[PDB]
Scaffold this active site. Structure first.
Site, PDB file in Angstrom:
ATOM      1  N   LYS A   1      85.526  30.775  31.651  1.00 27.43           N
ATOM      2  CA  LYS A   1      85.958  30.550  33.035  1.00 27.43           C
ATOM      3  C   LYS A   1      87.158  29.583  33.007  1.00 27.43           C
ATOM      4  CE  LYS A   1      86.179  28.447  36.213  1.00 27.43           C
ATOM      5  NZ  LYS A   1      87.275  27.960  37.089  1.00 27.43           N
TER       6      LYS A   1
ATOM      7  N   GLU B   1      83.330  17.635  27.169  1.00 25.48           N
ATOM      8  CA  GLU B   1      84.480  16.838  26.731  1.00 25.48           C
ATOM      9  C   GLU B   1      85.130  16.329  28.003  1.00 25.48           C
ATOM     10  OE1 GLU B   1      85.768  16.347  23.433  1.00 25.48           O
ATOM     11  OE2 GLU B   1      84.466  17.676  22.363  1.00 25.48           O
TER      12      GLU B   1
ATOM     13  N   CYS C   1      93.444  14.146  27.822  1.00 24.25           N
ATOM     14  CA  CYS C   1      92.244  13.333  27.849  1.00 24.25           C
ATOM     15  C   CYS C   1      92.348  12.148  26.856  1.00 24.25           C
ATOM     16  CB  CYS C   1      91.009  14.193  27.561  1.00 24.25           C
ATOM     17  SG  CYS C   1      90.827  15.547  28.746  1.00 24.25           S
TER      18      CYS C   1
ATOM     19  N   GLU D   1      91.353   6.362  34.709  1.00 28.83           N
ATOM     20  CA  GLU D   1      92.190   7.397  34.112  1.00 28.83           C
ATOM     21  C   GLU D   1      93.165   7.945  35.142  1.00 28.83           C
ATOM     22  OE1 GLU D   1      90.361  11.191  32.861  1.00 28.83           O
ATOM     23  OE2 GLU D   1      91.732  11.146  31.122  1.00 28.83           O
TER      24      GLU D   1
END
Lengths: 494, 493, 494, 493
Positions: free
Chosen positions: C189, C264, C299, C396
Site C-alpha cells: 500500500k 520504522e 527519518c 522531528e
C-alpha cells in the site's frame, strides 16, 4: 596467598604420582622403564616417572578405540557430558594448590603464575567447552523441498595430543578440553620435561566420571609421540612444539593413515609501538611482560619490539626499568616474576643467542647466567638493540631475550613485522582509530593485540598460526573443528 | 543438437593448448608439449604446453605479485562478486564449446557435460560469488575494556591440482571458493584433461579476473609436485587418489608447512533394506551410482549392500537398469556410458574385472568393447562377492559393482564402515528411526537416504572421513581451506 | 548522461500507469475511484490513480491468501525463487530511467538522486535477498540422542506493507525484498503521495514471473492502510511512517488478529563532532548532506548537530559554505542537489518549525520558502543555533532544518544525544580509537556512524529503532525475522 | 520424601509475602494486602503485598537507576554468568522449599514441582548464563574503507507478567534470558501464584544480583496494566490468555511503543495415524498431554485427532491411561493430578464440560470431586466431538480432551490447522516421509513427532503462530526479545 615457607613445606610432604594413566588406572611402563623427573629450580629429582614405549602407547590407543567405538562417552547426551567435564574442572580447582605446586616444581614456573594463570586457565578451558556442548548445533540446509538436508558434526574418534613443557597443564587442557567435549577419546603425551600435572589430572578425570580409556596419559620422551603420529588407529593428532618435530608429525600422519594433523608451533612475534601510543608506561611494562613472562618460554613472546625513532630513547629507558621486576628467583617464592629455565640444554641455547647478540647488537640490559650455585637454571632478562636482519631478531630463542628494532614510519614497521616465516601473533600501540584498524588488518598473524599484548585469556579468541607458526586454532568454537568431521545427510522424501 | 551436429562442431573447433599465465596464453618455457589424446578414438586433439619448473615459478610469482598489490583481494566484496558472476555468465554463454571440450578431452558423454559438468562449474562460481557479501566474522562476547573481533582473511597463493574424471567441475570446486575469498590461484589440471581449464582461464581474464590472479599450468605430475613443494605457495588443494594424496601432504610439510587439503578415493556402500520405499527407483539409482561417468567417480556406489530377502529380485532389476549404460560414442547425446580415459586406466579396470571373475559371480557385463575405434570402452559390470573380496575392498575407478548380501541392519552397518575410506554412503528405508539411526552411524562425509549422488546442491559440504580426504568442498565450509582466522583484541582502557 | 532537456522531453512523452495491480493484472478501483497524483515540482497533475477502498483491499488479500496457501511461490525451491527475484531486479535496472523519472515527478526528489540512489537501491535490495535465499539455513539442535531436533523458519503467509513518500521505491523494496524472498505473498500500500513506482514495479514483477496474487499494489490514502492493519486474513504488517500512524497500526494489529506489526518510525538523530575529528571539512560537508539530502525528508536525518564549543564557530562557517550546494532547484535538472517538498501542507509545517526556530534560537542561514511562482514547494536549507531543549531541537521537522547545539565535553554530548524518545541513528566524528568505540557503544540508536553519516547503503547492516523510532530491522538477514516464524521440530526415534 | 514429610514441612514453613523492590522486601503502598489461598484445601497461606501505582513506579525507577549505573549491564560476561549460576545453585539448594511453595500456592503435584518446575527454572537460568560468553555479534562483509560491526545491547528495563499454571518456570523463562543479557527486570507474578516469585527474588539478592536489577511486584491485573502502560519500561513479556495479550499490545502501543512479546493460549492438535510406532506409548502420552498439570497448559494436547481405523481401540487405551490422573492431594508424591487453581476456574472448566455433554459424547470423567476438602478438583475428562464443537474450538485450560476422528492424513492436517491458535502440534507415524511432510505442514511453533511435550530442552524456541503469541521463549532466540540490534559503520578513509 600462601608464603614461600608454606610452599616449601607442601613440597616436602608432597606425594608425587609418576605412573602412566591408561584405561582407568595408574600403570608402570612395560618392563619397568622410568625416567627421572628433575626440577629446574635446583636439579632435585622429584620422582621416577613411567617411560612409555610401544607396548604402552598401543595399550592406551586400544583402550581409547574401544571406549569410543562402545560409545561410553560419545553416546552420552550433551548435558551429561557437560556435567562430567564441569565436575573435573571443579576437582582441578579443589586441587589447585597441589596442581600449581606440581607445575612449579616440574617446569620452574613461578608459583604466583601457576596458581593464577596455568591451573585456573586449564579449568576455565574445560568448563567453557563443557558449557558450549549444548549451545551450538548443526544446520538444516536451504535445499530443494523434496529433501531434508542436514549438516552435522561428529567426533573424529581417537585423538592423540602431544604437548610441550612451557605451559604443561594449560596447553594440555587446550587440546583435551575441546577434544573430550566433542565425544572423542584422548591419548595425551606430555613432555618428558613436564609430565606431572598431566598425570595428576588423569586421576582426577577418572574420579569425575570420565570413563576408562576416554582420557589416557602416556609419559616418556620422543618415541611415544612418533608412535602416536604413526598409529593406524589414531584419527587425529594435535601437537604444540617446535617446527622440526611439527614437520615430522605431519609427515608420519600422512605416511601412515592420513590422520588429521594439527600443529601450534613457534613465533617471532612483533610488538609495534608508535609515537601516539596512548600510555607509554603501560606499553613499556607490557613489552617487558611480553618477553619475560614465563621466562620468554612462550610461543607468542613479543620478541621483536619495533619502536618509532621519535620515542625510542624514552621507551627503552622505561623498558629497562620494567625489566628489573623480572630478576630471576626461586619460583616457590610468590613474589618472584621470573623463574627457572627448563634445563641446562635450554639455558645453553639461550646463552648462545645472547653471545650472538653481543656481537651484532647493543646490549641494553641483562645478558648473564645467574644463581648457578643453586643447581638450577637461571638467566637475567636481556634486551638488545639490533637491526631487523640480526640473528637474534630472526630466530626463535625461546628465552627472555628481546630484540629492539627502530623504525621511521608505520609502513616500514609493518614490512619488518611481516618479514618472517612465523605468524603466531603481533601487536600495535596507537591512539589513532584508523591506524589501529588498518595496521591490525595488515599484520599477518593469528592474534593481533591493539594497545595490549598477551591480554587476558578469553576462550572466545581462536589462537594459532599463519605461515609456519602452525595450522588450525586452539580456543573458541573453532577449536572443535580439529576434533570433528562434517557430515551432509540428504534425506529424499520423494 | 544431434550426434552429427556434435561431430561437425568437434571438427570445426579451434583448441587452445597453451598455458595461461599472468594474463596471457604462453607456451611452456623451452616450448615442450604433450599430445592431448581423446579417449573416444585415440585421435590427437591438440599439443598442450608441458610445463615445468620455470612455468610453475612464473605462475606463482604472478599470483604472489597480484595478491600483494591487492588487485583482487583489495576489491570490495560486491566488486569481486560482480566479476565472478560475469565469468560464470561467460561459461554459460560458451556452454556448448566447454561441454564439447570436456567430452573430447575426457570421454564424458555430451549429454552429461552439457547438463552436469559445465552448469555445475558455473553454479559453483556463482554460489560462492553470491556468498561473499552475506557472511562475516564475529564480535566476541569479551570483557568490556576490549573490542574483540574474529575475522577471516585470504591465505594468499593457492595451488589447486585436480583430476581428470570431472575436470572443469572439480577445478571450479577449488577455484570458485578460493577466488571468492580473494586469493590468487594457480591451477594444475591433469595431463589427461587440460582443455577446459585452459579455456576457462581465458574467459576469466575476459571477465576481469586480473592478470596473475587465475593461472593454469598444464602438464603431468611434476608441476603438481613442484606446486606442493613451492616456497611461496600458501595452500594446496588436491583431488585425486589416496596414494598420491599422501605424497602431497609430505611435500607440503617438508617445504613450508603450506595448508594441504585433499579429496581422495572411496569405496562407498549403498545399503538397500526390505522396506526401501521404491525398489525400482533404488535399483535404477544403484546402477547410476556405479555406471555414471564410467564409474570414474570417487563417490561411486561401488559396494551395493543388499538384504538377503530382496537380493534376487533386486539384482534382476539392477541388470535391467544396466542396459541403459551400453558403451557408446560420448558425442552421441543418447549415450550414458562413454569412454574410459586411456588404455592404462582401462587395463587397471580389466585387471579388477579379472580378479572378480576369480573370487565372485559375474552377473552382467565384464568385457572390453569396440577396440577397433581406437577408443577405450568397457561394459557396465556387476559381480556378486563376499565383503573380503579384492574388488570389494579396493577402489577400481571403473563401472564395476560389488554386490554384497547381509542379514540385518547391524551387519550392513558393520560391512559399510569396515573400510579405510569414508567419502560417502547411502541407505534406503521407509522407516523414520532406521533412516536417522543408520545415517548417523555411517562414517562418511555425505550420507544419502533414499537417494544417491542426489543433485548438486552447494549447501552440502563434501569430503572424506578417514583416508578419503580432509576438509570439505562445496558450502561455506569450503572457504575455510582458503582463509586464516584472525583474533583482534582491541584494548580501549 | 541525460540533460535537463532530455528528462523534460521524456516527462512530456511518458505514459503513466495509475491502476492498482491485483492478482496478476492491472485493475481500476471498485466504482472508478481515483485521486489526482500531483507533482511537487510545479503542481501539475501527473495521472489519475486508483483510489482503493474495502473491495480492492479484500480482493488483494484474498489473492495473496490463495496464492500463499496454494504454495505457488512458497513452494518453489530456494534457487527457483532466487532466479525470479533476480530477473525482476534486472528489469528494474533495464527500466532505471523510467522508474527514476516517475519517482522524481511523483515525490520531487532530484533526478541525480533517483537514478543513483533510489532505483539502484531498490534493485540491490531485491538482489541481495534473492542471493541470500539459498545460503542460510536452520539448526540441528545439540539435543538428547533419542531425538532429531530441528529449528527452522517458515514464511508467515500474507504480509501487508505500508510505505511512505520520502523514499517510495526504496522503502517499498526494503519491505517486499525480504518478504518475498522468504516465500510470503505481499499486499503493498504505497503513500497516496507517491504511488507510481510501486505500481510500475508490480507489472515488472509479474513479467519476471512473480505469480498472480503474490505481489499486489493497492494505491489510495489512509483507508486501505487501516483496513490492512485490521484484516483477519493478513498475518503481518510492516509499516514505515510517522509515529502517530505507527501507533494506530500497532493497535489495530493487536485488536484484530494479533498479526505481527513491525514499524520504522521517525528520528531526531544526533551527529556529534569533536575537536579531534579527522577532517573538519568533510565533517561539515557530510553534516550538510545529513540534513539537506532528500530535502531533510529522511527519518535518519542528522537533524541535531552537536558540536564542541572549541570548534563551533569554525564549523558553522564551513556548514554555511557546504549548505550553498543545496539551493533548491528543479529536480528534473541533474545538477540539482535538493528538490521539492512533497506538498504545501508539508511545506507549511516546515515553515512553522522555522518560525519556531526564530523564536527560540539564532538563525544561521536560510529560512525561507523559495520559487513559489513555479506552483511547486521549496524551502531553503536552514540552520539555527539552539539550546538542546528547543522545540526545533526536540521535535522531528522532516525538512531541511538543522539544530546546531554546542557542548563542552564528550559526556555532555552523549547525554544530549540520548535525551530523546527517538533512537533511529546517531554519529560521532573523532580520530581517537577509544572515543570512537566508547561513544558509538553508548549512543542509544539502531545505526551508529563513526566518521561518516548515512554512509553508503550496504545490505548487511540492520536498520531500525531503539525506543520510539520503531521495532525490528530492515536490511540484513535480520529483516527476514519479521516475515517468518520459528518452528522447533522434535523427532523422537525411540 | 513422603506425604507425611511434606505435611510437616508445610506446617513449619515460614512464607514471605512482601514485595521485593530495589534490594529490599517492602510492604505495598498503604500496607495493602491480598490473601494467598491454597487450592488444595482453601487454607490462607499468607497475606501478600497488593501492589499499585506507587510500588510499580518504585520498582521501574529502581530498575532504571540500576541499568543506567551499569551495576549489572556493565559487568563482564563471565562475571554475570557467575552470579546467575550462583542464583540457580541457590534455587537447587532451596528446591524443597520452592517446590512446596509452588504446590501450596498453585495446587501442582509435589512430584511435579520437585522434578519439573523448580529444576526447569534453575536449568533455564543456568543455560542462559552459560550462553552469555559463547555467542556474539558480527563483523559484516562490508566495503574495505569501513569496519562494520553488528551487535546486540540490552533494551533496558524489562517488565514480565506471568501466569499461575507454571509460576516459577514461566517466570524463569522470562527472567533467565532477560537478566543474562544485562537488563533490569520487574516481574509481576499472578495474584493466584505470588509465592515462588517473591522467594526467588530474595535468593537473587542473596546470590549477588544488584539492588533494582530484579524486582518482584505482587498483586492482580492493575500493576500488570501499569507496567504495560509505563512510560519508562522498554519491553513487556507476557504469558497468559490470548484476550489479555491483545490488551497488553494495545497498552504498549498507546504509551511509549515498548516492545511487547506474548506467549498466549492454544488448542494444540495431537495426530495419531495407524502406522504409529507404539500405540500404547501414544495413548499414555495422549493422556499426559491433556491431564498433566490439570490441563492447565497453554500447549495441552486438547484436540486428539485419531484415524478412524484405530479410533475405538485407541480410545480404550486412552480411558485406561486416564485412571492414573485421578485427582489427589498435591502434597502426596504419588499423585499425578492436583487441584484447579480456584473456584471461578473450576466453574469455568465445569461450564465447558456441560457444553461438551450437549454437543458430543462423554467418554470418561466429567465430575467435580473432593468438594469436602474445601479444595477444587475435577476428573480427567474425555469427549468425542466434531471439529466445530465449542469444546473443540475454545481453550478450556482444564483436563478436558476433545477426540476427533479423521479418514486420511490430508484431512487430519486440515483439521489440525483450522484454528486461530498455533502454539504446538504433534503427529505419530513410523513413516519417514509422513513424519517430515506432516511436521512441515503443521502451522505451530513446536511440532512433536512420536512424542508430546517431550522433555524441556533449552535449545528449542517455543511460542506461537497466529494467535498463540509472538516471539519465542527458550533458546538463543529468546534473547532477541530483550536486546536491540546496532549497526556501527566505522569509516577509516
Amino acid at each position: 596467598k600462601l608464603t614461600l615457607a608454606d610452599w616449601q613445606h607442601k613440597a616436602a610432604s608432597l606425594e608425587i604420582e609418576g605412573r602412566a594413566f591408561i584405561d582407568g588406572a595408574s600403570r608402570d611402563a612395560h618392563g619397568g622403564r622410568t625416567f627421572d623427573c628433575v626440577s629446574p629450580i635446583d636439579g632435585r629429582v622429584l620422582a621416577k616417572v613411567a617411560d612409555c614405549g610401544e607396548a604402552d602407547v598401543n595399550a592406551a590407543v586400544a583402550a581409547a578405540r574401544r571406549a569410543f567405538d562402545a560409545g561410553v562417552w560419545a553416546g552420552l547426551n550433551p548435558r551429561a557430558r557437560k556435567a562430567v567435564l564441569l565436575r573435573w574442572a571443579a576437582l582441578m580447582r579443589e586441587h589447585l594448590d597441589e596442581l600449581s605446586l606440581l607445575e612449579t616444581l616440574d617446569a620452574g614456573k613461578p608459583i604466583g603464575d601457576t596458581t593464577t594463570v596455568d591451573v585456573p586457565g586449564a579449568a576455565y578451558c574445560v568448563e567453557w567447552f563443557a558449557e558450549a556442548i549444548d549451545k551450538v548445533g548443526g544446520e538444516v540446509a536451504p535445499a530443494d523441498h523434496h529433501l531434508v538436508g542436514l549438516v552435522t558434526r561428529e567426533p573424529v574418534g581417537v585423538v592423540a595430543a602431544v604437548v610441550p613443557w612451557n605451559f604443561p597443564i594449560l596447553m594440555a587442557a587446550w587440546k583435551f578440553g575441546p577434544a573430550l567435549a566433542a565425544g572423542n577419546s584422548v591419548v595425551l603425551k606430555p613432555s618428558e620435561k613436564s609430565p606431572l600435572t598431566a598425570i595428576r589430572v588423569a586421576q582426577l578425570a577418572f574420579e569425575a566420571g570420565i570413563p576408562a580409556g576416554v582420557f589416557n596419559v602416556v609419559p616418556g620422551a620422543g618415541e611415544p609421540g612418533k608412535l602416536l603420529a604413526l598409529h593406524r588407529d589414531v584419527d587425529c593428532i594435535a601437537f604444540t612444539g617446535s617446527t622440526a618435530v611439527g614437520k615430522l608429525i605431519m609427515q608420519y600422519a600422512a605416511q601412515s593413515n592420513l590422520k588429521r594433523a594439527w600443529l601450534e608451533l613457534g613465533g617471532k612475534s612483533p610488538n609495534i609501538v608508535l609515537p601516539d601510543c596512548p600510555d607509554l608506561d603501560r606499553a613499556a611494562q607490557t613489552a617487558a611482560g611480553a618477553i619475560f613472562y614465563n621466562m620468554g618460554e612462550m610461543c607468542t613472546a613479543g620478541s621483536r619490539l619495533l619502536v618509532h625513532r621519535d620515542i625510542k630513547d624514552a621507551f627503552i629507558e622505561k623498558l629497562v626499568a620494567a625489566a628489573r621486576a623480572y630478576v630471576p628467583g626461586n619460583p616457590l617464592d610468590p613474589s618472584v616474576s621470573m623463574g627457572a629455565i627448563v634445563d641446562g640444554i635450554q639455558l645453553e641455547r639461550v646463552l648462545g643467542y645472547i653471545e650472538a647478540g653481543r656481537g651484532e647488537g647493543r646490549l641494553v640490559t641483562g645478558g648473564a647466567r645467574v644463581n648457578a650455585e643453586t643447581g638450577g637454571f637461571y638467566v637475567e632478562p636481556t634486551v638488545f638493540e639490533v637491526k631487523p636482519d640480526a640473528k637474534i631478531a630472526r630466530e626463535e630463542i625461546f628465552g627472555p631475550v628481546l630484540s629492539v628494532i627502530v623504525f621511521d614510519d608505520v609502513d616500514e614497521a609493518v614490512r619488518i613485522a611481516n618479514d618472517t616465516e612465523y605468524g603466531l601473533a603481533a601487536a600495535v600501540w596507537t591512539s589513532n582509530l584508523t591506524t589501529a584498524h588498518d595496521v591490525s588488518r595488515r599484520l599477518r598473524a593469528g592474534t593481533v593485540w591493539v594497545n595490549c599484548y598477551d591480554e587476558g585469556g578469553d576462550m572466545n579468541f581462536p589462537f594459532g598460526g599463519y605461515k609456519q607458526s602452525g595450522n588450525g586454532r586452539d580456543k573458541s568454537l573453532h577449536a572443535l573443528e580439529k576434533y570433528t568431521e562434517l557430515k551432509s545427510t540428504l534425506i529424499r522424501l520423494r
